[PDB]
């Protein structure tokens, strides 16, 4: 009758035999641990070898392992300040082709205001005490000494002689610790409010032109491993890296590898470039946030957004990310923010948006996947919400766990079979009832809304050709997120 | 299951976790503050 595992049948010795089996020993699904992998860049020290995944646990350890003032040091520092509970992995990308310079800062003029001059290099405030009758050379020297006194900056500085008629004039040449398309940083001034630059300085930033190419992620995606890597942070935006990772994820997101991965990116630029990129990529396994004139570099925003998104999705896969905020991220200055019409147009184009609420806090608005066009043109709304792909991944994870644990070494049969109560037999009807019960198991905790249409459209059949597989076709019946409220009053008076 | 915020489902440290949720807190609706904007003119020597 009963199929007993690891108990020797056909035995004679008179005793008692008791065995424990894990079949039907898990209820619901185990909580999936959230894991975040970042494809960042490292330089200077770079003790860890390039293209080697490192489980990093603190910002100091990242700085000592990926070099101080590197892309990955700052990115891991930004992430871990936002989501400590998640398991983090970093992969350095070595060096990128191009040039190792960012630009020059022209600081001319004499001042008489006993005030302070603040420069927001890469979003990190640098304050220099400007005294009365202070020549611009003194300010340049003090500023470069301050920059060298804060190694956390991704940019080193050196004061250069004026070599001109103007005596007070002096400039600070800026070099990037890593050479890539993300080396350029904003060197704005007089951000925030309540402070003003002193009267007698002319400040300008001449950014050196260049198109430093990002390093190729070729062995990096080959050295990831086999961990699920739910969410991946891409600071790069050039076509080759995203195409390579698209191939990687599509292999992972395929029906055989069973690994789930999502890419989160941030683009700093103008609205037209963001629209062009969103129209271009057209992928359901990557999401971008567009920012115009970000004082901080893009990769920091990408890291923080990925952290908060991973938190919100792991806590509840189908919960919309409408009011979630990016902690400690400096927003774009007023007058350089997309309005409602621009945000709606971007959401149509495919690039996610974000709201800058009162209090200098950046929210998430609608995270949407960059999927807008079906295979033969057309327009498919089946993958717009990142919640859709996240809930699909969670459903596949839960059902894979359930099937691999509840039915190992069983023996399927036709529905009319006269199988015993304890015998390991799974008819199509048994699998159908088990799938309906499991659907209820992740219906109590939302994520599947309707149930009846799922029951009618569920189709579990034996494969008439060949053997030993259940052809299962189920309508996803995914739940939807409360995004837009439309109400007409029609007062009756 | 209660829909939590900032309480990961992937936590196993036995220390208790309490959460303060600002939704479903205000009952009724707050009375709006009066805002009046006047489109007047300013004469000479006006510092506005």
UniProtKB/Swiss-Prot annotation, chain A:
Keywords: Host cytoplasm, Late protein, Viral contractile tail ejection system, Viral genome ejection through host cell envelope, Viral penetration into host cytoplasm, Viral tail protein, Viral tail sheath protein, Virion, Virus entry into host cell
Translocase is among the record's keywords: no
Induction: Expressed in the late phase of the viral replicative cycle. Expression of late genes is activated by the viral late transcription activator C.
KW Secreted (keyword) present: no
Disruption phenotype: No tail is synthesized.
Subunit and partners: Homomultimer.
Protein name: Tail sheath protein
């Amino acid at each position: 009758d009963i199929s007993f595992n690891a108990i020797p049948s056909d035995v004679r010795v008179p005793l008692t035999y008791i065995e424990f089996d894990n079949s039907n020993a898990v209820s619901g699904t185990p909580a999936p641990r959230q894991r975040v992998l970042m494809f960042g860049q490292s330089g200077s020290k770079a003790s860890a070898a390039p293209n080697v995944p490192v489980r990093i646990r603190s910002g100091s350890q990242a700085s000592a392992a990926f070099g101080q003032g590197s892309m990955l040091a700052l990115m891991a520092d930004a992430f871990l300040n936002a989501n400590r509970v998640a398991e983090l992995w970093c992969i350095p990308q070595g060096n990128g082709t191009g040039n190792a310079a960012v630009g020059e800062i022209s600081l001319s003029g004499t001042a008489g205001e006993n005030g302070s001059l603040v420069t927001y290099i890469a979003g990190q405030r640098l304050a220099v005490s400007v005294a009365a009758g202070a020549t611009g050379a003194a300010l340049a020297d003090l500023l470069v000494a301050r920059i060298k006194g804060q190694p956390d900056l991704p940019v080193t500085a050196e004061v250069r002689a004026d070599s001109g008629d103007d005596d007070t004039h002096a400039d600070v040449v800026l070099s990037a610790k890593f050479t890539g398309a993300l080396s350029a940083v904003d060197v704005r001034w007089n951000y925030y409010a309540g402070e003003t630059t002193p009267y007698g300085i002319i400040t300008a930033f001449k950014a050196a032109s260049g198109k430093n190419g990002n390093p190729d992620i070729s062995a990096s995606i080959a050295g990831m491993g086999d961990l699920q890597y739910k969410y991946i942070v891409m600071p790069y935006t050039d076509e080759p890296n995203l195409n390579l990772l698209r191939t990687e994820l599509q292999e992972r997101w395929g029906p055989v590898n069973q690994a789930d991965g999502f890419a989160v990116t941030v683009l700093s630029g103008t609205y037209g470039d963001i629209s062009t990129f969103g129209v271009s990529r057209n992928d359901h396994l990557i999401s971008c946030m567009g920012i115009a004139g970000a004082p901080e570099p893009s990769y920091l925003y990408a890291a923080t957004l990925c952290a908060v998104a991973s938190q919100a999705l792991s806590i509840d896969p189908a919960r919309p990310l409408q009011t979630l905020t990016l902690p400690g991220r400096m927003p774009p200055a007023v007058g350089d923010r997309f309005t409602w019409s621009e945000r709606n147009a971007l959401l149509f184009d495919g690039i996610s948006t974000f709201n800058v609420n009162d209090g200098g806090e950046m929210q998430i608005e609608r995270m949407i996947t960059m999927y807008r066009t079906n295979k033969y043109g057309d327009s498919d709304p089946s993958y717009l919400n990142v919640n859709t792909i996240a809930t699909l991944s969670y459903l596949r994870y839960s059902l894979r766990t359930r099937i691999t644990q509840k039915f190992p070494n069983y023996k399927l049969a036709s529905d009319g079979t006269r199988f015993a109560t304890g015998q390991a037999v799974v008819t199509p009807s048994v699998i159908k009832t088990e799938l309906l019960a499991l659907f209820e198991e992740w219906e109590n905790a939302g994520l599947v809304e309707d149930f009846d249409t799922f029951k009618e459209e569920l189709y579990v059949a034996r494969n008439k050709d060949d053997k030993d597989r259940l052809d299962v076709l189920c309508g996803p019946n995914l739940i939807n997120q409360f995004r837009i409220f439309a109400a007409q009053v029609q007062f009756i008076l």
